Symmetry: D3
Subunit: 238 residues, 6 copies
């Protein structure tokens, strides 16, 4: 292994320069299967990796696990191995009532409610997506007629208090996050997730290209699509 966590060598990538990076190891093979010659590479902790081919070019699919810290290990070590473009694919809730289950969100930049991003760039630096990646995702979305929202996502180091959830053991939310969801809503933030501030900041500050797309599956303010998009986007970025 050329790296400490992933269990991969540069040779294993067979010249891959682009990686699709879901959170859950169990999504990896499903994504790789949309491409030619899918083969498993390795599986260590929450990092499962597969290689496939897109129009002749090798591509990697590697899970990140939950959160910025796990994500930062995967991106660093994939970068060491030669990956230069990262496409995050996820499922997500939403915090805007005009956003429906089934919609697709493309993130231009993230609110940095995490900690790992600060290990790459100070807070003043924008957790912004690469323009080429965002363009590819948006146009891939249009080509399958998906209803898409493009904008800012809030990226939280917690699932509970940082997303202002009160349905918890203590039922309390620290001062910093009390009233925060309404504030993000008013500022036009589409949704919460947990990895994108780290991903976007570490790539934008290190010369790597990153993009993120997500399918909306729930919406707290209410009572395969996204995967096709990310793979279609990947072929425009090879």
């Amino acid at each position: 292994s050329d790296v400490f966590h992933l269990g991969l060598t540069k040779n294993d990538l067979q010249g891959a320069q682009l990686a699709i990076v879901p959170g859950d190891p169990e999504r990896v093979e499903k994504i790789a299967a949309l491409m030619d010659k899918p083969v498993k590479l390795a599986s260590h902790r929450e990092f499962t990796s597969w290689r496939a081919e897109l129009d002749g070019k090798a591509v990697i699919v590697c899970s990140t696990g939950i959160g910025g810290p796990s994500t930062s290990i995967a991106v660093e070590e994939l970068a060491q191995l030669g990956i230069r473009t990262f496409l995050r694919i996820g499922t997500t809730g939403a915090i805007q009532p005009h956003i429906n289950v089934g919609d697709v969100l493309v993130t231009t930049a993230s609110v940095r409610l995490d900690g790992a991003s600060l290990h790459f760039a100070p807070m003043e630096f924008p957790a912004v997506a690469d323009f080429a990646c965002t363009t590819a995702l948006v146009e891939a979305a249009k080509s399958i007629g998906a209803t898409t929202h493009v904008g800012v996502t809030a990226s939280s180091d917690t699932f509970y208090p940082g997303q202002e959830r009160y349905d918890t053991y203590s039922g309390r939310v620290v001062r910093r996050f009390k009233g925060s969801m309404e504030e993000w809503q008013a500022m036009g933030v589409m949704n919460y997730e947990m990895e994108s501030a780290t991903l976007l900041t570490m790539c934008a500050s290190q010369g790597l290209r990153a993009g993120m797309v997500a399918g909306v599956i729930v919406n707290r303010t209410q009572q395969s699509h996204a995967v096709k998009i990310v793979v279609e986007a990947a072929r425009r970025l090879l």
Copy 2:
């Protein structure tokens, strides 16, 4: 007059919903004159405003002055009058060795080295440009074959120490900015300027669309304004 600083009324805009916003009052008329039926509206402080027409639709050209604070006044008051899309056009140096004079920069988001942006959103919020505006600018730059760089800009509340200039009265740069230019360079930041962090943050946080394009007139390493102007107007056509 309606708004307090600009001296403009809703009627003056004649239905305009897009404004091109340069920094220098003296560049306003020049930009308006590239379009149809240019007419001067008002001039107060650093805020000179003209109206013109692009494909039969009224557009505004209004100067911002230097810095987030005056920028924030212009954008606020224009939004009060119905403007919903803002395109900044500037002149700029560069901090990357490969970025040449004559090159055009399109800003996806800014490093927030200002103060005014914090009056709209906390620092964790990204000073990010609107996707449609940035797309329009990039496509307009392809249209005229300009050499374009797209990426992150550092937006400073000062021309001197915040851009790590030592050729100054005191020769001093405060701890926070000592070594900062090298830092931004390694992080891939293209350039310094003085308004975009405020513009982008105030717009992205209030449902307004903003983009920014700048022509490079010099390079901090190693030391076409019309080309950047041509791009901003052509991008404006696509956003009407």
Copy 3:
């Protein structure tokens, strides 16, 4: 001649030995202030920086506009210092936040609340945005000599006119968390007024061996309204200049 500085379009010769500048925010006010002095002459006009020279008791004086905000102020002050100015007197307009302060009153600033960003490019937040003792003394004693209604104290200096001065009559009608309830807080702490340049001016001068003073005329009382419906301070800044030459 080729300008000695990048923005102002001036040479050291243009100053004729001047070491003091009166610095209004509005370019259009420059001529008016210089007119109150001897031998007023227009020097230059670039962007928001209009400059005039004049004479006071036989001494050359500069009047130069800053534009609104710390950033444009920081350029004017830096470049004037390069040209030889060592004393700066800001003359501005202001919104009062104390109920008994009348429109037209003159406020002399001892130090400012740093609600700006440019001051941080000169000194960390812990450093006081304090006025020079000589300049403040000249302003207070000038204000006394002509009998103006005058208040002396702390000013809040904001990078915005709207949310940072907790104005709600705006496009969004919203004010970010940091500034919600802020005016009442400054009011309780005895802060006199809001304006937009002094924190930068006072910080960059006090931390770089330059003298600065700050005086402003009240144009709206914020305990009553956000925007006005629609001179003493000016006589004062000129008289104070006289005492500091």
Copy 4:
């Protein structure tokens, strides 16, 4: 079926357990549970593998957290919902002090908060401090088997690389905040780096939960593997289970 969103567990599955041993790696869970009575698999979802066992007639949970504060915060919250009130983290670690040797045991009294998740529970001023009873039990368990034990402060980082001032990376760059930082923590007596304890200790200390942490030292950067890690692993594992015994 489940009483919580991620863990795939119900209160019934815990059979009244109030104490959880929380390793990072799902692979270690079975190993830990194996040192106790009546061990059995419960569930595995994402990085959260849980087993139940019994000590002195009382049920105990072993549940992995994954890497980092964010996944740790989910496991701790959901375990608390299910009734857990005491959490013992067990890890393997490097050391940053010249005189902390491979094979030594570290018991953490509190952590430097170089993470993000802790701030979602308390402002930075609040100490990422371990519970006294837990720390006491760990230190006493360590003594009962003659380990060389260091008790003190741990630095808890959201990253493996720049937050631990590693330059052997793709960029070879460390952000200003962390340039020279390892030397600073060293001079302040910080024992080691790891990635979960600031979140664990802060969230528990500020919500009336008891937490402790023990780790075995398997490497030392300032000092310059295979069977030893396994040996060290087994030793800190022995300690965390002996400590749990005292805490039931």
Copy 5:
């Protein structure tokens, strides 16, 4: 007027090999604490720094006041360290903020909320104001020997007596935004009490290889109605004081 240090007026000889100091805030308490040990003698008194030496189980020990606050505490601790002290035990008085913590109770602090400024002169805010495990163990065991109702946990350490502890009974009657609603916040987070020296003491020791512990007697509860008289408050002091001396015995 021989002194090895700038403020305390003490020399290394004065310590007679002492390596442990008991550090109350009030100079008037020093003689009282020294009187619980053997052959106490007064060493010096300058500003808020009064110091005595005594013997505990045959070994010299110093008792030296810190004054109120982290700044004067930082001077005393630094100068005692220069003189050879390696272990510091603070004995204080405190206001409890939990309803279940009664006047007369003894609090042992494991770590403190850093609502001070001096601690930042030793370590950035991320660093824990944490007590030494041996000192804390010694205090807890001593409480058991003396017999006391003891609580062990987190203390909020404030640079002020008034707004930082969210008191409105003041000249201005206001509390700055940062501290408005803060007492209820610390209460929900399990914080036992407020005092004014521990964040500085604990941080400066924990980051410099010195051992520190903190014990306090509760003289008032911010949630209760009845304010104990100054007399019954004296007995609580005496109780915590006995515990700090007994704790010292285990650390020599």
Copy 6:
């Protein structure tokens, strides 16, 4: 009897006094009160020693604050509760400018807030600024007494050692925030270090109380770290005269 928690004073003890002179060292209180008429000891508790005196027929209080912002914040608050509305601090200080000599008198217009207690009264953005009248009184008193005087910004530290970048210490090191800080302040024209002014000035300026600050230079830090006063004390008494 006492109307306040720490000082051991009743309103009646002040005899209508509205101005206090506040030195750091309790032992200096008696000395300062002696320069005035009818000096009488009031109380001594912890680091708070208080005397009353008379200046041109009006009662004046002299009360020590102890070292640092926290004990200072207690004395100021409690004196305010008892009716004091003007506070003049008289201290000792280490100068950090080459051209300022031992024995010079420094008048502080405002302070760098290297403390923590000030933040309990106002956020960091608020200036730790002296009252204009008090500052004016001190500057004019210095002319009257005759002293080499400098007027400007002071750095006010919560520590004597690392916050004033002292290296004659047990650890011999200083935390990152303060490494190279003295030279930074010197370049910014800061005159001197002391330990109470940021808290005093902030708490007063933000609460409608008047405060001023004067100090005698006991060491010059560009030459020496550990030291090696009457001018400064005569000045604060003469200034009090003008503020009555």
